[PDB]
RNA sequence: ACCCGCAGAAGAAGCACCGGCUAACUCCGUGCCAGCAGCCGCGGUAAUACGGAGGGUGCAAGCGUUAAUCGGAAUUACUGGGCGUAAAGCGCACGCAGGCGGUUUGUUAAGUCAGAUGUGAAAUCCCCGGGCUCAACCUGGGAACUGCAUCUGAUACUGGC
RNA sequence: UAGCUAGUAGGUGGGGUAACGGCUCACCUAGGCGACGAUCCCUAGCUGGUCUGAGAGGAUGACCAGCCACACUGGAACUG
């Protein structure tokens, strides 16, 4: 550029690719969950993957991920929402959290346990 | 035209040896000569001459030991909408001493060694290998 | 006297048919751990045939490094098309400093004591030619009659 | 040393003091360099010397009046 | 205006004091403009036990600084 | 806690006796000596070779009994006051009082020259020390603890100071259980199993 | 505090990872399905990649996960970027305010630099040392805030005249 | 979002404050301000400082020191 430039402005920089406005800032919020439904995905590969409906308790309503192996949803039985990034699916940033209000764990498990949900003590 | 005295001189010099010569001359003045003053001081120059009394102009002789070159840089560095301007330590230390830095002071023009030894500072104008 | 390394292997990327090429490419260094380099580019089926087409080009070259205090003689510009580099000396009992890549050119010409800047491609079969053009940019005077330094 | 600056008058419509326009150098937000810049203030006067596009050199005060600091001394160029 | 007192060197429930010269005003953290020995009320049959800093106290002698009660009996627990 | 399980893998990865659970005459014990862990083998990919340093780096942490947190402020202060990395580490942690200990005599291993230390038994300049990252510096002198000296242990350890290399940096005897660390160990009068020229190529992550 | 007893090894070890980068791996179940990942990718009867299982890798009283913000992005180019084409030169010319302008001798000392005074606390990163078992906390001076004001100077260069 | 404007702009009296000044009650004239973004609208505690780094800045405002306002809210006054 030439040397008289860049005069009572700073530059612009780019967003470090936010993209969950129905949060609120927060780091995870409730949904009742209304519907379930399979959409294809990208790339080659003998597989689908399934999608989720979900009203929040903040007045929002958006599509979720889900997975874990497989699914337990039910309608209005009340779920968590946070990010997530995929990549699994084309057009989606949400993800369901295991273990939490109706979602389930993971059933038997002797490693990882940690991740995913895992079972309560007794017996 | 004449509309600035180093963005003249370097140039000059910097192509005349990309052409090979062994003398360039350019349009003179008391700024052009006080840098070639340094220049010869130095060793990179073997002669300099000042003739046309009322339109003056500089011829300068560059000093070859063998073959090809005697600048292995020749750059301004400094701006005439901001000038380096250098404290009495914070002279640079040019091609990390292989070259040498030219000031303007208020005893005259000089090599930072020249500055340094007589406690100076002042504004960079030429950065020399 | 003599030092000898291997910096990189690469198979060649071309879908032939059907399957791919069996070709590869590699890069060594030759010097002397004392102020001396080489480098050779080789192009060959399979790897034992193409580190030897790589060696047989490095024992076939060889350039002096400009050295002063034990560092290099000057800091110094060497360009080949994206690599932009920019070799310059560094300070006394020192060599880390040198790492990456850059530093298994100069384990082999034997001086750690030296800072390096790529400004684009760190590729290592085009900045290899890159750091040479800096070699043959070296200056060695051939001017002490006239100019200081040495 | 006294407190002082030197400017162009640019409007005598008021009725005791006048305007003036003063000029100062500032630096550019990243190359550095120095660029003028205006201030056109208030300045204090009850002589009635000077007009439009004259030059007048003032001192700054005690504070004069609301937002007046600043007097005038001497004329120092007449316009034409 | 200046006095005599004391200043905490830092040591969580370990009480050691530094001497110190202040005027005895505002906020007591801070403020001393010089220091003049260690109080250490801590010391037992050690070589180093309350110590003063006979060069640094040399202008606030006599009349030079205030005496306070915190330091009315510094001149017997020091060695003289 | 301290390491747990059998030591005696660390001398199969090697092929040779690296020091552990020694008694006596430290030789046989029907403990599989000399044998390599394993029958898969044998035939092994021959590293990146990267991992050379990292595996280098394993030796010395197995050795002088330090983690990777504590070997990265030991390479931080090794890249100091004149010399390379590599040799300055090497004699940094030669400087630790579990191994001064060990050198010393009072311990048949580092697990129990440390057992010294970390149940208050190690003495240095009249002082009682319980920290094995303390550091042993010139004409320091190390002892036993009076009413410890008599300890069946350490008279038990006296049986490999009359087998190993007598350290030409430090000096001890039994008939006080005193000794003192003379001087800085140099490279060209101390010679290791470890590889010097590796050791500095660190970091890298 | 600091030291000394009674009880008996008494109450005290996990977390992530095991296709590749990435150290650790093999044996069954499934058979392009179902499940898995940061990205590339895995899966049709020999799956180290899914479920199952023994061991192993790395960290350890912690280990993994994640949210925001920086950083690699010399991928907003002050340090340190481009405009024939891949993305950018106004349809074009004129011009108020702004930016920029030959040369020498006087003169001024604004800008620039020099000799000093005053200050930038506590700190920053760094060099050397101290009060307490180490350390915090507290230090006690260096290195330093390269600016801002005043005093006393220099006049080449830039600007004023 | 490009225009804003009768303490707005200069002047004359007498008050007020510890003190300069429309701070204040009343006159006499028609000026003054805006691209360094005035006006109009939204939103808001913040500097020294921190993390990263050759250096700098977007964002942040703990420490260790400063610093604007509030005590339901909208506001006022005395004592000092």
Avoid at chain 1, 76 to 98: A, E, F, M, N, Q
Avoid at chain 2, 25 to 52: H, Q, R, Y
Wanted: hydrophobic share 35%.
């Amino acid at each position: 550029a030439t040397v008289n430039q860049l005069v009572r402005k700073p530059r612009a920089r780019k967003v470090a690719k936010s993209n969950v406005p129905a949060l609120e800032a927060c780091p995870q919020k409730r949904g009742v969950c209304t519907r379930v439904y399979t959409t294809t995905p990208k790339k080659p590969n003998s597989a689908l993957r399934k999608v989720c409906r979900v009203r929040l308790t903040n007045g929002f309503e958006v599509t979720s991920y889900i997975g874990g192996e497989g699914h337990n949803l039910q309608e209005h039985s009340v779920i968590l929402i946070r990010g997530g990034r995929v990549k699994d699916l084309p057009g989606v940033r949400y993800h369901t959290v295991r273990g939490a209000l109706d979602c389930s764990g993971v059933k038997d498990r002797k490693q990882a346990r940690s991740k995913y949900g895992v079972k309560r003590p007794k017996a | 035209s004449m509309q600035d005295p180093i963005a003249d001189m370097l140039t000059r010099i910097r192509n005349g040896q990309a052409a090979n010569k062994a003398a360039v001359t350019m349009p003179s003045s008391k700024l052009k000569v006080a840098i070639a003053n340094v220049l010869k001081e130095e060793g990179f120059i073997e002669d300099f001459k000042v003739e046309g009394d009322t339109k003056p102009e500089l011829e300068l002789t560059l000093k070859y030991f063998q073959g090809k070159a005697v600048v292995e840089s020749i750059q301004r560095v400094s701006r005439p909408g901001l000038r380096i301007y250098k404290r009495k330590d914070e002279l640079p230390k040019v091609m990390a001493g292989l070259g040498i830095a030219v000031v303007s002071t208020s005893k005259g023009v000089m090599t930072d060694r020249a500055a340094r030894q007589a406690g100076l500072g002042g504004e960079i104008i030429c950065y020399v290998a | 006297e003599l030092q000898e390394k291997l910096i990189a292997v690469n198979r060649v990327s071309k879908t032939v048919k059907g399957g791919r090429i069996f070709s590869f490419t590699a890069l060594t260094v030759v010097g002397d751990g004392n102020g001396r380099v080489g480098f050779g580019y080789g192009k060959a089926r399979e790897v034992p045939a193409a580190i030897q087409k790589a060696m047989e080009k490095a024992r076939r070259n060889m350039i002096n490094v400009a050295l002063n205090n034990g560092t290099l003689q000057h800091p110094v510009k060497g360009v080949h098309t994206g690599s932009r580099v920019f070799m310059q000396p560094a300070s006394e009992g020192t060599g880390i400093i040198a790492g990456g890549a850059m530093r298994a050119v100069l384990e082999v010409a034997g001086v750690h004591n030296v800072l390096a800047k790529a400004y684009g491609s760190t590729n290592p079969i085009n900045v290899v030619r890159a750091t040479i053009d800096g070699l043959e940019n070296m200056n060695s005077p051939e001017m002490v009659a006239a100019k200081r330094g040495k | 040393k006294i407190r002082t600056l030197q400017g162009r008058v640019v409007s005598d419509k008021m009725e005791k003091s006048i305007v003036v326009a003063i000029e100062r150098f500032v630096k550019h937000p990243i190359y550095g360099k120095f660029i003028k810049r205006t201030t056109k203030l208030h300045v204090h006067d009850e002589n009635n010397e000077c007009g439009i596009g004259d030059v007048v050199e003032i001192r700054e005060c005690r504070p004069l009046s609301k937002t007046k600091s600043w007097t005038l001394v001497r004329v120092v160029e007449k316009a034409v | 205006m200046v006095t005599i007192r004391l200043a905490r060197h830092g040591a969580k429930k370990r009480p050691f004091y530094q001497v110190v010269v202040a005027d005895s005003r505002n906020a007591r953290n801070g403020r001393f403009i010089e220091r003049v020995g260690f109080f250490n009320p801590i010391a037992s049959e050690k070589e180093e036990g309350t110590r003063l800093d006979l060069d640094r106290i040399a202008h606030w002698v006599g009349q030079g600084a205030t005496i306070s009660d915190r330091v009315a009996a510094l001149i017997k627990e020091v060695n003289k | 806690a301290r390491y747990l399980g059998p030591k005696l893998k660390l001398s199969r990865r090697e092929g040779t006796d690296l020091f552990l659970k020694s008694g006596v005459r430290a030789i046989d014990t029907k403990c599989k000596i000399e044998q390599a862990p394993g029958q898969h083998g044998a035939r092994k990919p021959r590293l990146s070779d990267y991992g050379v340093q990292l595996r280098e780096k394993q030796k010395v942490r197995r050795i002088y009994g330090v983690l990777e947190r504590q070997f990265r402020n030991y390479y931080k202060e090794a890249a100091r006051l004149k010399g390379n990395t590599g040799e300055n580490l090497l004699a940094l942690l030669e400087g630790r009082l579990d191994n001064v200990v060990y050198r010393m005599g009072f311990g048949a291993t580092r697990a129990e020259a440390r057992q010294l230390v970390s149940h208050k038994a190690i003495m240095v300049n009249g002082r009682v020390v319980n920290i094995a990252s303390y550091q042993v510096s010139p004409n320091d002198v190390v002892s036993i603890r009076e009413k410890a000296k008599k300890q069946s242990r350490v008279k038990a350890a006296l049986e490999l100071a009359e087998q190993r290399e007598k350290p030409t940096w430090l000096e001890v005897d039994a008939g006080k259980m005193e000794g003192t660390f003379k001087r800085k160990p140099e490279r060209s009068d101390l010679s290791a199993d470890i590889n010097e020229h590796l050791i500095v190529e660190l970091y890298s992550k």
